[PDB]
Amino acid sequence: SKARVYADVNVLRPKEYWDYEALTVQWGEQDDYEVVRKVGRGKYSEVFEGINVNNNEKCIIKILKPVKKKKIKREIKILQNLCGGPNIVKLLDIVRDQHSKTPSLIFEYVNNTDFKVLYPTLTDYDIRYYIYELLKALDYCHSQGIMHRDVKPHNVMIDHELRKLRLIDWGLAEFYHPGKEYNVRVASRYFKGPELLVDLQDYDYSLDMWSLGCMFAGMIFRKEPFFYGHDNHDQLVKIAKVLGTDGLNVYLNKYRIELDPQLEALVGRHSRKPWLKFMNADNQHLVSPEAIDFLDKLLRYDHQERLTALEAMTHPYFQQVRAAENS
Numbered sequence: 001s002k003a004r005v006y007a008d009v010n011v012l013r014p015k016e017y018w019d020y021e022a023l024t025v026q027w028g029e030q031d032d033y034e035v036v037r038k039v040g041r042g043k044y045s046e047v048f049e050g051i052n053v054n055n056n057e058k059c060i061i062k063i064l065k066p067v068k069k070k071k072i073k074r075e076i077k078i079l080q081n082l083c084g085g086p087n088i089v090k091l092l093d094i095v096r097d098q099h100s101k102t103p104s105l106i107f108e109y110v111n112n113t114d115f116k117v118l119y120p121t122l123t124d125y126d127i128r129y130y131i132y133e134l135l136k137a138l139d140y141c142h143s144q145g146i147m148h149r150d151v152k153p154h155n156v157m158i159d160h161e162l163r164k165l166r167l168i169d170w171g172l173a174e175f176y177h178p179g180k181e182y183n184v185r186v187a188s189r190y191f192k193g194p195e196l197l198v199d200l201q202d203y204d205y206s207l208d209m210w211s212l213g214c215m216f217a218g219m220i221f222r223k224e225p226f227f228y229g230h231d232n233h234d235q236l237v238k239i240a241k242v243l244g245t246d247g248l249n250v251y252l253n254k255y256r257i258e259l260d261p262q263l264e265a266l267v268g269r270h271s272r273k274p275w276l277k278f279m280n281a282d283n284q285h286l287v288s289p290e291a292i293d294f295l296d297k298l299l300r301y302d303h304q305e306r307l308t309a310l311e312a313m314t315h316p317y318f319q320q321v322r323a324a325e326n327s
């Protein structure tokens, strides 16, 4: 399997662009940034809200904990390559300490609304507007030969007050290379594409479109995790119960994959449940014929069949968002 679009972008670019292991970061000054309060974490990092002590501007400080070398360079190089792109979080500086305690990434400030409280307030047009803005980020990173791999509500920061959208946390992002076998342990369970669930390792940018599709279904149908599995195996079962098992079998046959007999039985046999069955009076105002059509073109087993981000932008569902953008 090879990406339908932007498959050879990294080949055409110099080795330095995509060879992140050979990256010699230019460290800034840790003194220029004070850490104020933790909004951060404990996976591969801690995120805080701080200020730039040279202009008093707020910023986001991400401190990398027990996450050794490869990954850090990888995230830094992808961020530098994308800085300036439409709706891509902006890496302002990269600092550390002279003596020991290591890594810290500085970002432009971002101001969120726990997506769980925001999504219910979104109107039909707001969803169209924000998904379209997210589409600009993915088409840009993809055209730059980069896969995000962790698209989910938490990583799509939305400042509704300012109608601003930022795709954050590129810690799981990677450069795309034709035929390369990637790690499938990426994304968050509910947004994992079928490829990752059946171990199809030579995936591509289309993985992000499946994640986007899961978010979209979740937003228009008012069903937060649209595909709510309990584990990686049960995630595939939940997907099969909606898309149907006939399409799953076609996909496996095409890419020559055979499921673990215990997983195959677990998935079983299911008919395709039409998208209209998730519609109700609660989400009615968000559903339309075009919204169902768009979603249908994103949530396809076969990654090669899914709409690319660019093609997604021209779907009729966005025609209004697109027009307003003219002058």
Ligand SMILES: Brc1c(Br)c(Br)c2[nH]nnc2c1Br
Residues within 6 Å of the ligand: 039, 040, 041, 047, 060, 062, 089, 107, 110, 157, 168, 169, 170
């Ligand atoms: Br909250 C938050 C914000 Br804001 C940014 Br920016 C992040 N980048 N990586 N992880 C992040 C988290 Br958690």
